Amino acid sequence: SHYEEGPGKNIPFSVENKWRLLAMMTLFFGSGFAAPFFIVRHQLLKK
Amino acid sequence: ASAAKGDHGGTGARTWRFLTFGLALPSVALCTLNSWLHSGHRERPAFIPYHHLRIRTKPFSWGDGNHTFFHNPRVNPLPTGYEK
Amino acid sequence: ASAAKGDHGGTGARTWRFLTFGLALPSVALCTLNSWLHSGHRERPAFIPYHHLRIRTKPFSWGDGNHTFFHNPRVNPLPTGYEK
Amino acid sequence: YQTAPFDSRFPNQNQTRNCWQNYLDFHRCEKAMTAKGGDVSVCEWYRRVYKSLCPISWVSTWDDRRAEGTFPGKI
Amino acid sequence: YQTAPFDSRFPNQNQTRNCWQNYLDFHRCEKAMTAKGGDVSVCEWYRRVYKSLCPISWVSTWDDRRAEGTFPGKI
Amino acid sequence: MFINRWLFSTNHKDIGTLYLLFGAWAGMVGTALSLLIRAELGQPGTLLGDDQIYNVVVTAHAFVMIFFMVMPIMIGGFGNWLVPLMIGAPDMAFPRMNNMSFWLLPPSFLLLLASSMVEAGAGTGWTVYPPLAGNLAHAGASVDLTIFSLHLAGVSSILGAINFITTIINMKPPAMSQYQTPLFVWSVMITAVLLLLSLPVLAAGITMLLTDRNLNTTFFDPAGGGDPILYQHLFWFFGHPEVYILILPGFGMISHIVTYYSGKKEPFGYMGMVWAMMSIGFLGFIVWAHHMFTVGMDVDTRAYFTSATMIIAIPTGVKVFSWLATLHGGNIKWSPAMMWALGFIFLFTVGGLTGIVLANSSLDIVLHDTYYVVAHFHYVLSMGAVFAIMGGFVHWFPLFSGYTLNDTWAKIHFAIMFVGVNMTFFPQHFLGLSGMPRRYSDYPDAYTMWNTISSMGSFISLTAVMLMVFIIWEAFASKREVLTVDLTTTNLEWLNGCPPPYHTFEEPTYVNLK
Amino acid sequence: MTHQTHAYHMVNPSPWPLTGALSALLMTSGLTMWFHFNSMTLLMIGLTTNMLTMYQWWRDVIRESTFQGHHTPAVQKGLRYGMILFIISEVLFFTGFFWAFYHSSLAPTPELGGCWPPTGIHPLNPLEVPLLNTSVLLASGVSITWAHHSLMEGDRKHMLQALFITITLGVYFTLLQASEYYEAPFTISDGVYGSTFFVATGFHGLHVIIGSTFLIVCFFRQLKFHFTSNHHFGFEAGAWYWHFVDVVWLFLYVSIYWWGS
Amino acid sequence: MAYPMQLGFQDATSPIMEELLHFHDHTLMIVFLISSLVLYIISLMLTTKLTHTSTMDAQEVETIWTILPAIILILIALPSLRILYMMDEINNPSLTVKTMGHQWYWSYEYTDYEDLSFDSYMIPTSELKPGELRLLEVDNRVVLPMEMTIRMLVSSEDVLHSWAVPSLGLKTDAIPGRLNQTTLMSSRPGLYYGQCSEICGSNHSFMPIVLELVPLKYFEKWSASML
Amino acid sequence: FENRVAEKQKLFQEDNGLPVHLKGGATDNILYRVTMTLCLGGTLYSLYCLGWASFP
Ligand code: HEA
Ligand code: HEA
Ligand SMILES: [Cu+2]
Numbered sequence A: 001s002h003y004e005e006g007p008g009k010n011i012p013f014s015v016e017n018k019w020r021l022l023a024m025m026t027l028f029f030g031s032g033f034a035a036p037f038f039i040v041r042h043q044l045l046k047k
Numbered sequence B, C: 001a002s003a004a005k006g007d008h009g010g011t012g013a014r015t016w017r018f019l020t021f022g023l024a025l026p027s028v029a030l031c032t033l034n035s036w037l038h039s040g041h042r043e044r045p046a047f048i049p050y051h052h053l054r055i056r057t058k059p060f061s062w063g064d065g066n067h068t069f070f071h072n073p074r075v076n077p078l079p080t081g082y083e084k
Numbered sequence D, E: 001y002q003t004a005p006f007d008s009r010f011p012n013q014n015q016t017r018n019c020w021q022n023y024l025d026f027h028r029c030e031k032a033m034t035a036k037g038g039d040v041s042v043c044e045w046y047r048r049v050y051k052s053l054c055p056i057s058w059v060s061t062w063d064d065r066r067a068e069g070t071f072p073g074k075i
Numbered sequence F: 001m002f003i004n005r006w007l008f009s010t011n012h013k014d015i016g017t018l019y020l021l022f023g024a025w026a027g028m029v030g031t032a033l034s035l036l037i038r039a040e041l042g043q044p045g046t047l048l049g050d051d052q053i054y055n056v057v058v059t060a061h062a063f064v065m066i067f068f069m070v071m072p073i074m075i076g077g078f079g080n081w082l083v084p085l086m087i088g089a090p091d092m093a094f095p096r097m098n099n100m101s102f103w104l105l106p107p108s109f110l111l112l113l114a115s116s117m118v119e120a121g122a123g124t125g126w127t128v129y130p131p132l133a134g135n136l137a138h139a140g141a142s143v144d145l146t147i148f149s150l151h152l153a154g155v156s157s158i159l160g161a162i163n164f165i166t167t168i169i170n171m172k173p174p175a176m177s178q179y180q181t182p183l184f185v186w187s188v189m190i191t192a193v194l195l196l197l198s199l200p201v202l203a204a205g206i207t208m209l210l211t212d213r214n215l216n217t218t219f220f221d222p223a224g225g226g227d228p229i230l231y232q233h234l235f236w237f238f239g240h241p242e243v244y245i246l247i248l249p250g251f252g253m254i255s256h257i258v259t260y261y262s263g264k265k266e267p268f269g270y271m272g273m274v275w276a277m278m279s280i281g282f283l284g285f286i287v288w289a290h291h292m293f294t295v296g297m298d299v300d301t302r303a304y305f306t307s308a309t310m311i312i313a314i315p316t317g318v319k320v321f322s323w324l325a326t327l328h329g330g331n332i333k334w335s336p337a338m339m340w341a342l343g344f345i346f347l348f349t350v351g352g353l354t355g356i357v358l359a360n361s362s363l364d365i366v367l368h369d370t371y372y373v374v375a376h377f378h379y380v381l382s383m384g385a386v387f388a389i390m391g392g393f394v395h396w397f398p399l400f401s402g403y404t405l406n407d408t409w410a411k412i413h414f415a416i417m418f419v420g421v422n423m424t425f426f427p428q429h430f431l432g433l434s435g436m437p438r439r440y441s442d443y444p445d446a447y448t449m450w451n452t453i454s455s456m457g458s459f460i461s462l463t464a465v466m467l468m469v470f471i472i473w474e475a476f477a478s479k480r481e482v483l484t485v486d487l488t489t490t491n492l493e494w495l496n497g498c499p500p501p502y503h504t505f506e507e508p509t510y511v512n513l514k
Numbered sequence G: 001m002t003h004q005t006h007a008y009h010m011v012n013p014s015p016w017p018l019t020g021a022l023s024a025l026l027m028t029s030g031l032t033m034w035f036h037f038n039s040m041t042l043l044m045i046g047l048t049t050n051m052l053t054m055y056q057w058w059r060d061v062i063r064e065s066t067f068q069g070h071h072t073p074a075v076q077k078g079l080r081y082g083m084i085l086f087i088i089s090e091v092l093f094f095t096g097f098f099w100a101f102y103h104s105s106l107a108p109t110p111e112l113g114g115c116w117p118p119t120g121i122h123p124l125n126p127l128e129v130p131l132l133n134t135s136v137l138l139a140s141g142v143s144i145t146w147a148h149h150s151l152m153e154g155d156r157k158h159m160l161q162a163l164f165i166t167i168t169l170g171v172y173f174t175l176l177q178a179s180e181y182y183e184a185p186f187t188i189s190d191g192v193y194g195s196t197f198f199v200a201t202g203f204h205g206l207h208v209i210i211g212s213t214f215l216i217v218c219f220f221r222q223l224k225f226h227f228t229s230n231h232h233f234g235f236e237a238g239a240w241y242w243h244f245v246d247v248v249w250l251f252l253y254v255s256i257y258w259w260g261s
Numbered sequence H: 001m002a003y004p005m006q007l008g009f010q011d012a013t014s015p016i017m018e019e020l021l022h023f024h025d026h027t028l029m030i031v032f033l034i035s036s037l038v039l040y041i042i043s044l045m046l047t048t049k050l051t052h053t054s055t056m057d058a059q060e061v062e063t064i065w066t067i068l069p070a071i072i073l074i075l076i077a078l079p080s081l082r083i084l085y086m087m088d089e090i091n092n093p094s095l096t097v098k099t100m101g102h103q104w105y106w107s108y109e110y111t112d113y114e115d116l117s118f119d120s121y122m123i124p125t126s127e128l129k130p131g132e133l134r135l136l137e138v139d140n141r142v143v144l145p146m147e148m149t150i151r152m153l154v155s156s157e158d159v160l161h162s163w164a165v166p167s168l169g170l171k172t173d174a175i176p177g178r179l180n181q182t183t184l185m186s187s188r189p190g191l192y193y194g195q196c197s198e199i200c201g202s203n204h205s206f207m208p209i210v211l212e213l214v215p216l217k218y219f220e221k222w223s224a225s226m227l
Numbered sequence I: 001f002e003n004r005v006a007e008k009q010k011l012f013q014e015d016n017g018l019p020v021h022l023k024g025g026a027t028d029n030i031l032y033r034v035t036m037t038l039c040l041g042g043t044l045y046s047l048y049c050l051g052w053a054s055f056p
């Protein structure tokens, strides 16, 4: 198995640059929290 | 009305002893209580000389030949009517 | 309505092959005949627009949306009445 | 009326219930037309049938049972 | 008559059958007193009860069903 | 490479990580939905609109938190991560099937998201009861999509239930009896059985609902002779076991956390603890009807169900008292996880005590469909199931990642969330005793105070789940690698270091047959 | 380490779970198109990728067991458990439908005529073809057993012969049942009686087809000498599934065809 | 009805509702006992430097904590069940009113003698006269005789609804095709409010119930002027 | 009949560093790509339909 091992390597996202990570976490959790808001908006704009 | 539950894949004596004291016996206790709580003494049923009941085509082989074996006077009337 | 019968204490493949051709298959033949003899073609039932039947709250996803899947016109009327 | 006609709900060799049912039916109807008046209307049909089919002895004993109040059927 | 009284054969929270039974009963009695005359006696009791307990819409639709002959109950 | 590892996996650790990631994200969506709910109820009037757009929101909140956050995290996340490690197995019995379980989830979630977009969504309540859920009062693809989402999520969970039971039973060291496996493993083995027997009945129910609205059947339609109540029986037959399926893995994690931070070798009364969960799991199958007290059932049967429901308090009691007995002579360590464990023990007690009240049909007549029942289940879910998830998450994070969390921050996070949830749900006991119904977008003027306070608490909770995200970021940004772990003699999961290698127990574990 | 010393199977990364998950998406949403925007293209694609997945996923399993020898005793004991458990979830699936049936037939609503079978419904005769279908299924129960016994005794020809007889009886039932559907004087739309009948007997029908393709697969695996007199789980399972199927029919017969009609 | 900043139940207008208040007090007294007991034990456990991390014998104490909860449950169950049957009790009503839930209004039917039936709709907060309750006032109150045993029969003509009136301690779902029964018996005149207690669509929150209880005399004159 | 499981055992046990779902040749590969293609496309098509149905 050419699967790398150890801290920061057993995850599907890069943890090498703390700020790239910051961006990714922000989009990840961010897009998840915003979805309901935009769905309600979408439903409010129909007819 | 159940479906089933907690699987414990390996059954030896410890498992059956576990079911005995952890399931079997506790049930006998609950039902015992239940039956001890629902112990409502029904008032002896109204006597009415129905012909399909208190049958007697041959006197019983004991006593006065008119008394059923586990005769309970309180709830079992003779053909004529309740005992006393 | 049976109870059971001829015990043959030792069951191997020969025994199951024996039951297959000596019991299983012969039954399928009898019942086949029976069902081939009782093949009485019932005259299509009288149509009466009962409301609890021929239900239609949403047209079926096929055809004219009013024809059930294995629709047999001879014995299945539309809500309006028999097909033709 | 000639005799009790064929009854679909009693299509077999055993007519015991046929006799039984109509005997009940009649007496049940009778009791009602009584306790209602309704110009004391009367359910003769049932009596014609039950009299035809039920052997005398059954009717008799049932009547007696109804007399002493030991009749097992619900009227 | 005040209102339909308590009925032992219908002792629980669900009265659906109570309404149903009396509606049948009435119409069954009605049909008989008609086809018998018996001085055209009448089974009002059942109608008083069924009218009290059965919501209007049910009675209505049932009557219509009885009209077009699509009423599922046996009268 | 990435594909092979992350999309074509057969590794219990990686699948488990994939779950935690899915659960956390779904947890964001559910939190957003819970905020719109309190946003709407935080001032007398209508913010969004009619009970349709509102109830669409309430419904998605329930489905998301129950099926997409709690279940994936506890069973798929911790289940897959820890079970094999705790019994010394190389992996699970069916590595491939295990992966399908996970991948069935994102699609299932899509169908649910899709349902609230087309038409006017599904404003049926998480119970999706007919006639409201039918093709007349709810025409359109919405409910159908809600149903299909549930089918997949169910297929996913019983496939995994099959995997856990097989693994747990068939893959322990030859000398290890079942009465030698840890409470968490027992906890998921039992939860797995509840899923196997309840989930299919649900699928039978909603499939009948699906045909009723697309194939002209009348299972729940009076017209054809159907019965809307029949759906209630089927749904609730699954519906109750479902909540125990939700708390059991939590019971297990709590047993592990309390014991570890008390410095004890094992939990007090291990066999009593096994007996307790087994009893809980079983009684949980014969009490469904307590959810139908105001439906018109026979007084006698109504009496049976209140009694049957009440005896569940006994075994649950032996567990609460056992965790207390575990803390007894302990050398307590006031770690974040221990804080979550203590909160759970109390809050869960209160919430379950409040459920004994509702167990009474007579009193439930006036308590049913009110906010009292909303309080009951949020206590056992928001400060029961969730507190276990947080305690387990902060406790095992180092094992999963290899990095450590900032304990102080982690403690701040508990403080905030503890205040938030209580302020949110405490008032709701009153609103319910005083008559405020469930599933209302607006209420009579009298209920204004408590609803206001309640909504404010939900904002504090928002603050806490935002901080947590940061807390995870910082942990990964700083990179303090784990060195030493205590009590490993009695905690196998940690023996292979943090994080354990892709392949653990390549060469078995040696266990003597005394 | 490096070389494993446990008797388990570490399966190679497979794309199939992803593929089958995507399949479920396609079939479910595809049904939604068929039901609402009247389209099957999506439903067609889903059914397709689904067969593709099952074929491959099961092809590999065969490869790993028969060709590669990964099915050690420990691995097999686990497969037995899996099957049992699966059959169990199925037993509980059918239980929803018998619940439904009994609920309706034991307490017939007035809109039905306050009776069972509802007025207007002309139930089939249990003594006619239903009786035939019963004897057919039961016979395949004895013949599949004969097959199993020949296999353990290494009797290639006979196992093949019995497996064949078994398979045709399963097909015979399918056809017979198919005709019954077509001649039935009632439909899915005929209230609760039709619902209750067509979905229970229908789901069972689907199961007889699923069980027959399984036995067919077993047939060919045998033609190819895959099974040894001692290791043939693929058959054991096919056999267990097949019995589950007779049993469900026995309850259907007695409950729906006999009692509730 | 409910007033501002209320904590417990609305005041009992009928005897079973009184009976419930007392049962709840009983039940609540116990949840206070247990919930405070647990909290005390917890703080007790966490407040000593003394340790005993070796093995501890279970089972022994395990009986105390299994038999005790068992006794307490009977103490709740008994009262509960009694009230339960007391509700489904053999009473003879002197009136029968029917109510039919509809998508966003209830309709009542007094049909013992004459076919009287009307619709009860919520008064739009816009057309409320000063002093009228925002989401609780209905245009046509259901008038009934105080101090009398009435039999209510709840059903629906569409989706599910639930007819409830807290002050009287009533709540019965309204299931289409079904006639659920309940006994109403106010022991005091007045206006008694309730709301739909079942999710039924867009205006689920806007279909209230208002009972107005006056003496028989006024009841019958109302009934007639109603048709 | 035949009996050549022995040939296939060898073919599949061959240390070519290939995953079982490809260990069998070129067809395995085309089947794989076809399956993968249909799935992804289908998934794309489904997303389009949902975007389309979301609107009035
Ligand atoms: C994980 C979640 C969870 C858990 C564990 C439970 C646990 C319990 N719940 Fe449930 N409940 C919900 C979540 C949960 N519930 C949800 C989601 C709903 C609403 C669904 C809906 O309708 O939308 C609900 C609804 C609900 C109802 C119906 C309300 C209505 O009218 O609509 C009822 C009534 O019986 C009930 C009761 C109980 C009981 C008796 C327990 C018991 O398990 C409690 C056991 C705990 C204790 C008893 C405390 C600890 C023990 C002791 C300290 C021993 C000593 C104590 C005594 C002697 C009392 N719950
Ligand atoms: C898991 C169960 C769950 C949880 C945790 C919650 C949490 C919340 N819910 Fe609840 N809710 C339900 C399930 C849940 N809910 C259900 C079943 C219903 C019934 C629906 C119906 O009536 O049909 C309901 C109904 C419901 C109502 C009633 C609406 C009505 O009937 O009119 C309200 C209103 O206040 C509400 C609010 C909230 C709030 C404020 C939170 C807040 O406490 C949320 C706080 C945020 C969190 C606790 C999530 C943070 C946790 C994570 C994000 C995990 C992170 C991941 C890792 C660490 C890896 N919910
Ligand atoms: Cu429950």
Ligand SMILES: [Cu+2]
Pocket (backbone or CB within 6 Å): H101, H102, H104, H160, H161, H162, H196, H197, H198, H199, H200, H204, H207
């Ligand atoms: Cu309503």
Ligand SMILES: [Cu+2]
Pocket (backbone or CB within 6 Å): H161, H162, H196, H197, H198, H199, H200, H201, H203, H204, H205, H207
């Ligand atoms: Cu409503």
Ligand SMILES: [Mg+2]
Pocket (backbone or CB within 6 Å): F369, H197, H198
């Ligand atoms: Mg309800």
